[PDB]
PDB file of C-alpha atoms in Angstrom:
ATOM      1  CA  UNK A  23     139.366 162.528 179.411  1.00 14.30           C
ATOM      2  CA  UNK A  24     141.140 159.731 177.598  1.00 15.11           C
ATOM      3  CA  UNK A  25     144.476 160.626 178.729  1.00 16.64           C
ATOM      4  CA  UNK A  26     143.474 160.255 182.518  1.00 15.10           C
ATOM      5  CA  UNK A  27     141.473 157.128 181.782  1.00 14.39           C
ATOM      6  CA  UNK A  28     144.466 155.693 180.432  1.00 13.23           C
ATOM      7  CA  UNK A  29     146.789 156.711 183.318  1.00 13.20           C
ATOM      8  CA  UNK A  30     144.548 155.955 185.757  1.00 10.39           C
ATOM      9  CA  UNK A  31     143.872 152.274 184.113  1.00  8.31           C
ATOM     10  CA  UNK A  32     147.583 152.001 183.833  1.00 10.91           C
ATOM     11  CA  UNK A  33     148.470 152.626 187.353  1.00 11.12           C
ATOM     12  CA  UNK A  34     145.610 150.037 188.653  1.00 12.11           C
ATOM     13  CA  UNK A  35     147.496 147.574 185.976  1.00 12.01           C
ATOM     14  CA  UNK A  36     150.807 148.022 188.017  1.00  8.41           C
ATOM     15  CA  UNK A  37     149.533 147.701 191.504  1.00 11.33           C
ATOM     16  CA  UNK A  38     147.940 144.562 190.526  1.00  7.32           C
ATOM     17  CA  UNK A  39     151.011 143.144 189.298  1.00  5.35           C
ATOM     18  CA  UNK A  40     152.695 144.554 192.238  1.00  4.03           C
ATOM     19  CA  UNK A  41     149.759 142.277 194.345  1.00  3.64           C
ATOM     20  CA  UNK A  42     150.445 139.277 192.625  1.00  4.30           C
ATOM     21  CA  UNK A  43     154.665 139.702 193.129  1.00  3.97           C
ATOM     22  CA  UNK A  44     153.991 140.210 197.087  1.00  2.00           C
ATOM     23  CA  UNK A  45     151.415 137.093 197.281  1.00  2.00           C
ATOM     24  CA  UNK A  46     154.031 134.963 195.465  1.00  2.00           C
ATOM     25  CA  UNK A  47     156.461 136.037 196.989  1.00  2.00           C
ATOM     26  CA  UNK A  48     155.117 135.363 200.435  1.00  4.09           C
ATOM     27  CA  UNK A  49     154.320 131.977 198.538  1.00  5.13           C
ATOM     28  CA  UNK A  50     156.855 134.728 185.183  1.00  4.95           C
ATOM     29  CA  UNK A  51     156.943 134.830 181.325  1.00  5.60           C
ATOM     30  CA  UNK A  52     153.670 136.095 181.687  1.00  3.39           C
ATOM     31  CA  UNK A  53     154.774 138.949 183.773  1.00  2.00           C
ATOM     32  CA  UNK A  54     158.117 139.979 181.066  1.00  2.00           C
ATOM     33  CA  UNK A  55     154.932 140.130 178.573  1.00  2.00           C
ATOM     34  CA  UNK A  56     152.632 142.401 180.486  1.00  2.00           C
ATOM     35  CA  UNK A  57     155.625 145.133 181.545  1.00  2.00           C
ATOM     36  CA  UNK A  58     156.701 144.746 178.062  1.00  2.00           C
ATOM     37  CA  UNK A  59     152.575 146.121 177.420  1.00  2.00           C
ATOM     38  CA  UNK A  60     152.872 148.698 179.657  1.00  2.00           C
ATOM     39  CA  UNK A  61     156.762 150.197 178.212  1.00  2.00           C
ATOM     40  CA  UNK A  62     154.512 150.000 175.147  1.00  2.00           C
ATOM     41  CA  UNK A  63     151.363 152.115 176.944  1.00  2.00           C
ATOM     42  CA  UNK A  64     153.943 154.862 178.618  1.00  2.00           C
ATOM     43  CA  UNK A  65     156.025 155.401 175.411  1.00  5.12           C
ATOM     44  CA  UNK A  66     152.424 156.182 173.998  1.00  6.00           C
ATOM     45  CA  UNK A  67     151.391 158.312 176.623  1.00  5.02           C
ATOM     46  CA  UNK A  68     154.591 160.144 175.976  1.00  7.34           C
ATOM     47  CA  UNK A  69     153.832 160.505 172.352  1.00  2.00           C
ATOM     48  CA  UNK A  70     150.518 161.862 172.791  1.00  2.00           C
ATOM     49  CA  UNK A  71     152.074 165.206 175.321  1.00  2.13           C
ATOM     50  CA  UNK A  72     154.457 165.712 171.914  1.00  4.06           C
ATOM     51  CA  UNK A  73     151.429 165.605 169.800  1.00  3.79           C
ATOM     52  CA  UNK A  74     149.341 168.090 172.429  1.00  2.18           C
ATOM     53  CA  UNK A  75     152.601 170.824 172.721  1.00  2.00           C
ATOM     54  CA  UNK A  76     152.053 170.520 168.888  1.00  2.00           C
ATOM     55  CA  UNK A  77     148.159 170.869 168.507  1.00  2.00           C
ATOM     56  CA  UNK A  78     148.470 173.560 170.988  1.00  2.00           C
ATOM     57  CA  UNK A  79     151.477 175.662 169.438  1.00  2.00           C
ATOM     58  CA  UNK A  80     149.160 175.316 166.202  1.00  2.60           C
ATOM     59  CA  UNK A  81     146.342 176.337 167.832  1.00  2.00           C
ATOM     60  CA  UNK A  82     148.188 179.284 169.292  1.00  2.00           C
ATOM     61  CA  UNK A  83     150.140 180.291 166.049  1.00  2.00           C
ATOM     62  CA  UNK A  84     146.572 179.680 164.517  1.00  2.00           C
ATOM     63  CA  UNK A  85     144.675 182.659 166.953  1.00  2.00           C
ATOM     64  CA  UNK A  86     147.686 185.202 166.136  1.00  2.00           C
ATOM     65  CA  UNK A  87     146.993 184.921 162.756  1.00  2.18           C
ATOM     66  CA  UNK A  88     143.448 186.031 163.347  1.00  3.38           C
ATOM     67  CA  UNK A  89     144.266 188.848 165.544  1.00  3.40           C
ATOM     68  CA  UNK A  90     146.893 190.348 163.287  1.00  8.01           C
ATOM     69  CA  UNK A  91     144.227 189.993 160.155  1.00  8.88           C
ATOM     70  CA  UNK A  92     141.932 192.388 162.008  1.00  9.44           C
ATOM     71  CA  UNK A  93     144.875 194.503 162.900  1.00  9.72           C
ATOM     72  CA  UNK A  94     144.734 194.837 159.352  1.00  8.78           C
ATOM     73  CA  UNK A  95     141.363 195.195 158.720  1.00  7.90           C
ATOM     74  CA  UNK A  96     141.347 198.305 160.931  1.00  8.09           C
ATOM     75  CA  UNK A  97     144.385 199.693 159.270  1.00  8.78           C
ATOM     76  CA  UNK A  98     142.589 199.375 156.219  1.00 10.46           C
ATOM     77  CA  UNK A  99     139.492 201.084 157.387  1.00 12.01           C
ATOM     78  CA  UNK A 100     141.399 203.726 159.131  1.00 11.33           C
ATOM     79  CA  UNK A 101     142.950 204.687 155.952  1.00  7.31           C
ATOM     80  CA  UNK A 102     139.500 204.695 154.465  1.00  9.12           C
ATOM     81  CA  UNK A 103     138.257 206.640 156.517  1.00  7.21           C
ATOM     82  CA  UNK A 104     140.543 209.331 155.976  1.00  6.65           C
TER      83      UNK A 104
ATOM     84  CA  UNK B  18     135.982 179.908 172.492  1.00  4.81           C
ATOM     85  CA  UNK B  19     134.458 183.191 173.356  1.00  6.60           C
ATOM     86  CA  UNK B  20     137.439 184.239 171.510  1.00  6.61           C
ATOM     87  CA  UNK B  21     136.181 182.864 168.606  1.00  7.63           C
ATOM     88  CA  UNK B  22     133.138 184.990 169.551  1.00 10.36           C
ATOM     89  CA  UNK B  23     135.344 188.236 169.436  1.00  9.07           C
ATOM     90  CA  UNK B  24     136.860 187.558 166.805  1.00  9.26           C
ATOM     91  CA  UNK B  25     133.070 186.995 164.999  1.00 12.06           C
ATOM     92  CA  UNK B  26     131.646 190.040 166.156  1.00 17.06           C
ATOM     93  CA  UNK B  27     134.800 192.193 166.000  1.00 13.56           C
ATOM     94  CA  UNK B  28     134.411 191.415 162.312  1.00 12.98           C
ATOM     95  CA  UNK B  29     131.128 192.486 162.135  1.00 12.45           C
ATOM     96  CA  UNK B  30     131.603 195.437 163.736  1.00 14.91           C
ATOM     97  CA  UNK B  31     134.186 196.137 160.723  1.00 12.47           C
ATOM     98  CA  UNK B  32     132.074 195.395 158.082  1.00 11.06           C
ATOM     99  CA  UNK B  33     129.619 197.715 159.218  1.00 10.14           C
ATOM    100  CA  UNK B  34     131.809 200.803 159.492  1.00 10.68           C
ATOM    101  CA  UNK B  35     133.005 199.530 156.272  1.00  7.97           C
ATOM    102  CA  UNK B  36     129.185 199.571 154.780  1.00  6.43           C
ATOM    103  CA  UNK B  37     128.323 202.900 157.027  1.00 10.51           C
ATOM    104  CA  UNK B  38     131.709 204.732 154.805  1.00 11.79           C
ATOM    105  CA  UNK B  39     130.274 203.236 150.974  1.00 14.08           C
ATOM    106  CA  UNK B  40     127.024 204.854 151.775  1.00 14.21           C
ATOM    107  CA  UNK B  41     128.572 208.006 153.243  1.00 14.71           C
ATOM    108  CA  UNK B  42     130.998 209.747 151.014  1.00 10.73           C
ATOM    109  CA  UNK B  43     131.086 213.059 153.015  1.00 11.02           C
ATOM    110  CA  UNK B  44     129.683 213.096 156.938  1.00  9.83           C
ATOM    111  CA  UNK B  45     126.529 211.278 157.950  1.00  8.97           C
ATOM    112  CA  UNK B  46     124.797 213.385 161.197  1.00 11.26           C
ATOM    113  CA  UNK B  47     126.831 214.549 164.157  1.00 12.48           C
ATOM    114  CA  UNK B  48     125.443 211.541 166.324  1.00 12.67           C
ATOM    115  CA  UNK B  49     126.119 208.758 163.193  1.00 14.34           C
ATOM    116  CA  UNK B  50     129.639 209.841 163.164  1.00 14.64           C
ATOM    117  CA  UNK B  51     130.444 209.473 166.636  1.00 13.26           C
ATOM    118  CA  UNK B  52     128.704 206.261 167.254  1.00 13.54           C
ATOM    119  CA  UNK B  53     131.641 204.839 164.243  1.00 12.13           C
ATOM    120  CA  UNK B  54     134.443 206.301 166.203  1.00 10.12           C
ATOM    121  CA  UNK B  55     133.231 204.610 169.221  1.00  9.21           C
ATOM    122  CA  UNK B  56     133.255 201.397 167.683  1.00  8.72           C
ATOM    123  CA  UNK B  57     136.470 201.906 166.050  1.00  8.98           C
ATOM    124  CA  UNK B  58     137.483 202.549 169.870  1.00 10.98           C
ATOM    125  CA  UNK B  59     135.749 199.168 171.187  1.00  9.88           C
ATOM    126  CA  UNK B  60     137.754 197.358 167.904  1.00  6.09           C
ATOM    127  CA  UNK B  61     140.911 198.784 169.101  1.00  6.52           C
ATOM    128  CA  UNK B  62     140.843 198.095 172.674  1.00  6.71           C
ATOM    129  CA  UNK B  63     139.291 194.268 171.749  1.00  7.98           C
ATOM    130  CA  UNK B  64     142.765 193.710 169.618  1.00  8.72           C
ATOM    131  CA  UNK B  65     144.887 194.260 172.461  1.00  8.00           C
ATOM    132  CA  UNK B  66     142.311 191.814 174.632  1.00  4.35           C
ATOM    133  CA  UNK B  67     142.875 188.961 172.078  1.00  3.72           C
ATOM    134  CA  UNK B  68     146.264 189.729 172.094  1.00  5.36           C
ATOM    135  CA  UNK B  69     146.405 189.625 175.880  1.00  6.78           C
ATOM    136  CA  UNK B  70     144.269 186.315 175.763  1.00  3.85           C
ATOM    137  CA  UNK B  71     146.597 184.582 174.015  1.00  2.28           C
ATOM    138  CA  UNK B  72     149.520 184.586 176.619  1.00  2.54           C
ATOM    139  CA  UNK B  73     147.080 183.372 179.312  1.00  2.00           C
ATOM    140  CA  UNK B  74     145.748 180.427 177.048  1.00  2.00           C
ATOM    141  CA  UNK B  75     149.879 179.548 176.179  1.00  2.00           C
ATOM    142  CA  UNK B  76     150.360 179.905 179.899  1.00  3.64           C
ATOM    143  CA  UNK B  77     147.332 177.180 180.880  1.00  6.99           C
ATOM    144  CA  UNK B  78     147.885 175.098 177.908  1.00  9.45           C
ATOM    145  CA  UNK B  79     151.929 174.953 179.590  1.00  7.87           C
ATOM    146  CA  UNK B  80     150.631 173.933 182.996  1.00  8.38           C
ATOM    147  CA  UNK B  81     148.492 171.603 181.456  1.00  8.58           C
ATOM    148  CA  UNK B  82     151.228 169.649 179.783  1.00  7.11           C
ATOM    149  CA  UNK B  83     153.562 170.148 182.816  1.00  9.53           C
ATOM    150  CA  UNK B  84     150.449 168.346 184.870  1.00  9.62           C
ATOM    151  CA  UNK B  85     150.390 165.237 182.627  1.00  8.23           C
ATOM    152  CA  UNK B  86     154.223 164.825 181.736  1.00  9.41           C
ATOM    153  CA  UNK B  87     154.329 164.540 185.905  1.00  8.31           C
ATOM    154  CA  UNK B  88     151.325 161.872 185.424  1.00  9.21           C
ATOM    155  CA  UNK B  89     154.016 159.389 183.190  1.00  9.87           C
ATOM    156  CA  UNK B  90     157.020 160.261 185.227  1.00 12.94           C
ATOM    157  CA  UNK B  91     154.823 158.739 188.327  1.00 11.62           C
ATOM    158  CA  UNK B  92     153.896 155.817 186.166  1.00 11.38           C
ATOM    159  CA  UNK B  93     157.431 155.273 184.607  1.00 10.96           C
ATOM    160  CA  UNK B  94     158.707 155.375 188.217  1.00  7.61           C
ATOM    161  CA  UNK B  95     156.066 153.169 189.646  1.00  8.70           C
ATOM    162  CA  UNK B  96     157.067 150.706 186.969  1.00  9.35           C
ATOM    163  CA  UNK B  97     160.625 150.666 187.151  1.00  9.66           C
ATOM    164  CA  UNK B  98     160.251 150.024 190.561  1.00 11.13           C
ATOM    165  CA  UNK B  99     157.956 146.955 189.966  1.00  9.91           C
ATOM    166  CA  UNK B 100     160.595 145.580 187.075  1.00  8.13           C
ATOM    167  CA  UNK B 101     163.636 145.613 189.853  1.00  4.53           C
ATOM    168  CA  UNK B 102     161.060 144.069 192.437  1.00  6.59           C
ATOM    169  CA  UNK B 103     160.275 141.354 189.650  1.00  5.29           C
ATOM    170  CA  UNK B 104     164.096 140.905 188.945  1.00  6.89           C
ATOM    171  CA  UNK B 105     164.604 140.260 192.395  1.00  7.26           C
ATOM    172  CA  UNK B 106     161.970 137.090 192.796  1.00  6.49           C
TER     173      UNK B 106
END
């Protein structure tokens, strides 16, 4: 699962930088760039739940519409049948 | 799915009551009859299935979303606790 792969990935990125701020600090521009990456990464991640409630409301909208045409195809038929 | 299965043979299952009535005009035999109103039973208890499928798939699909918006909050957290650390070198 992308999704996971990407948060898991993501969280690994942070701890390293996390790492590398305790090691210098027991001891910059680079570091403003990276977060800036990651803002970047999580505004994405939140993007893509949007686009899933979506797909899935669609999806769901999608197999009501199928139910209620064989609602109707039994109507039909029952009328037929008389 | 395996509601897309249902759905599949459900239709069938239509057509051929549908096929059974052009060739029958007036009754086929006792047993013929019966066998269509059992199958317009199975159709009509399979509807409210479907139906009844579709609130359990909304209600998964919800805690699915739920599970990864609490995924980024953890992230988002986790770095905006890293940026103060990094303002405070």
């Amino acid at each position: 699962d992308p999704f996971q792969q990407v948060v898991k990935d993501t969280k690994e990125q942070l701890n390293r930088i996390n790492n590398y701020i305790t090691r210098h600090n027991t001891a910059e521009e680079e570091i403003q760039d990276i977060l800036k990456d990651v803002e970047e990464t999580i505004v994405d991640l939140d993007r893509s739940i949007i686009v899933m409630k979506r797909d899935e409301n669609e999806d769901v909208s999608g197999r009501e519409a199928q139910v209620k045409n064989i609602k109707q195809q039994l109507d039909a038929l029952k009328l037929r049948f008389d």
